[PDB]
Amino acid sequence: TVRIAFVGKYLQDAGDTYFSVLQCFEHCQIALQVRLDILYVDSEELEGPNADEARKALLGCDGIFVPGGFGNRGVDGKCAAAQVARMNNIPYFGVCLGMQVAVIELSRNVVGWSDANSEEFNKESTHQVVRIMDCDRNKMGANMHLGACDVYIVEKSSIMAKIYSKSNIVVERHRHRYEVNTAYFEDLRKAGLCISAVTDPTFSSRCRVEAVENPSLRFFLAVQFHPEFISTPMDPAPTYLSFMAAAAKKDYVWPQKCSQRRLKQ
Ligand SMILES: [Cl-]
Ligand SMILES: [Cl-]
Ligand SMILES: [Cl-]
Numbered sequence: 575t576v577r578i579a580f581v582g583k584y585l586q587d588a589g590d591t592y593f594s595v596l597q598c599f600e601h602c603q604i605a606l607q608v609r610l611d612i613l614y615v616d617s618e619e620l621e622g623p624n625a626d627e628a629r630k631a632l633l634g635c636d637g638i639f640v641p642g643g644f645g646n647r648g649v650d651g652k653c654a655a656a657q658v659a660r661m662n663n664i665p666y667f668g669v670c671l672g673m674q675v676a677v678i679e680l681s682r683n684v685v686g687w688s689d690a691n692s693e694e695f696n697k698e699s700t701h702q703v704v705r706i707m708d709c710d711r712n713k714m715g716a717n718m719h720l721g722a723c724d725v726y727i728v729e730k731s732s733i734m735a736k737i738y739s740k741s742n743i744v745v746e747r748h749r750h751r752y753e754v755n756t757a758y759f760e761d762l763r764k765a766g767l768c769i770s771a772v773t774d775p776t777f778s779s780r781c782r783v784e785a786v787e788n789p790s791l792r793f794f795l796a797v798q799f800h801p802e803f804i805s806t807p808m809d810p811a812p813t814y815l816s817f818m819a820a821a822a823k824k825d826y827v828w829p830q831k832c833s834q835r836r837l838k839q
Contacts (some may be wrong), residue, residue: 588614655684745839771783
């Protein structure tokens with residue numbers, strides 16, 4: 575079996591929040607022919623004086639996964655999940671909040687900005703590594719990014735390039751508001767992060783980070799988009815599929831061309 579730490583809430587209080595995520599995991603399970611054993615971990619147990627107790631549980635997993643979530647609850651714990659993954663070379667996959675915590679984690683623990691956060695969780699941080707873009711904001715609020723958008727894979731040696739069968743542009747679906755702060759790209763790069771996919775291949779102030787990786791590690795990938803929004807039993811989301819492959823310690827034959835479900839029509 576393949577042990578994946580699912581860092582968020584217990585089954586009892588998750589409701590139907592992870593329905594589509596778990597569907598996608600099931601698609602991957604079938605395509606790889608592996609017995610998935612998800613450990614549902616309460617993210618709040620990964621913070622505070624006793625958190626080493628919870629960290630030890632993550633160290634026994636084959637993979638560590640951080641999905642999208644709501645509110646600021648367990649943000650520090652999700653950051654700590656990304657830290658364990660980065661420091662122990664345990665495959666990591668983050669989706670939307672999962673990417674943001676990878677960025678925050680790295681900013682605190684490698685870049686050395688102890689107060690690094692998203693603008694969402696600490697308005698008074700002097701290192702808002704995740705923030706609302708100026709073009710998305712006004713005095714009363716900001717855009718809620720939904721729907722499809724072109725994703726430019728800009729690193730040819732990346733996990734993204736490989737799992738999307740070397741397509742330069744793919745189309746994924748979104749539900750987010752805050753983006754990686756463009757002013758800190760060099761700092762993140764110096765700390766080992768590879769910006770592998772973006773909305774704008776020129777890297778302007780309007781460049782929205784769609785995927786980050788850590789190529790020093792076997793598998794560390796996190797995406798802004800929600801790959802579970804495009805996944806079927808016969809065409810599983812490549813991001814989830816590659817994560818589960820890595821956790822299972824298995825290879826996979828990627829098609830010669832990216833599926834039409836994730837290409838521009
Ligand atoms: Cl949570
Ligand atoms: Cl891979
Ligand atoms: Cl967001």
